[PDB]
Amino acid sequence: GWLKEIRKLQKSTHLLIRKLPFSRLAREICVKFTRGVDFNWQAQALLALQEAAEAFLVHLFEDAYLLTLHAGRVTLFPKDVQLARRIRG
């Protein structure tokens, strides 16, 4: 079932989060930390944010899934993600 889905996604390299929702999220979060000022992201830097966010989330879910196989689970509960951040610090 899922096994044809993993081995297709660990082969390709393209982005998974779509570009426009991530751009709207970045323009939302950026305007709170600059005292209500807009900015103008270059069209290259949003790719850098998105690549760092994808790499961080993929490494995070790999470590969380390494935690899930320890306790006999296969399912990835929210107890698992909030514990793989306090260990890493």
Binding site: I6, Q10, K11, S12, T13, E51, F56, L69, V74
Partner: protein, 100 residues
């Protein structure tokens, strides 16, 4: 007569010496240091690109793409410890599958 060809290197020597003068690293820069530095950088570049080219050859493609550097770094042991805190754009991951 150039200092790159005088030492038998390929990386430049004058540019490295220019970046060690204007880099605010010490007040005086010797002459025996940047040739050593360019030699070490050339060895590391050849060390990466050999594995990258072999992994590109084994995928039957005549061009180097960042997935091939990702595979060559994460399959080598020494560069796994040298580059252990590095994300690579257009990267992908290793084919990791594990069961219970």
């Amino acid at each position: 007569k150039s200092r790159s060809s005088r030492a038998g290197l390929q990386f430049p020597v004058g540019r490295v010496h220019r970046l060690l003068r204007k880099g605010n690293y010490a007040e005086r820069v010797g002459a025996g240091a940047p040739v050593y530095l360019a030699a070490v950088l050339e060895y590391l570049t050849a060390e990466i690109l050999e594995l990258a080219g072999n992994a590109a050859r084994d995928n039957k493609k005549t061009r180097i793409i960042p997935r091939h550097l990702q595979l060559a770094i994460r399959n080598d042991e020494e560069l796994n410890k040298l580059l252990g805190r590095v994300t690579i754009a257009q990267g992908g991951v290793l084919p990791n599958i594990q069961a219970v």
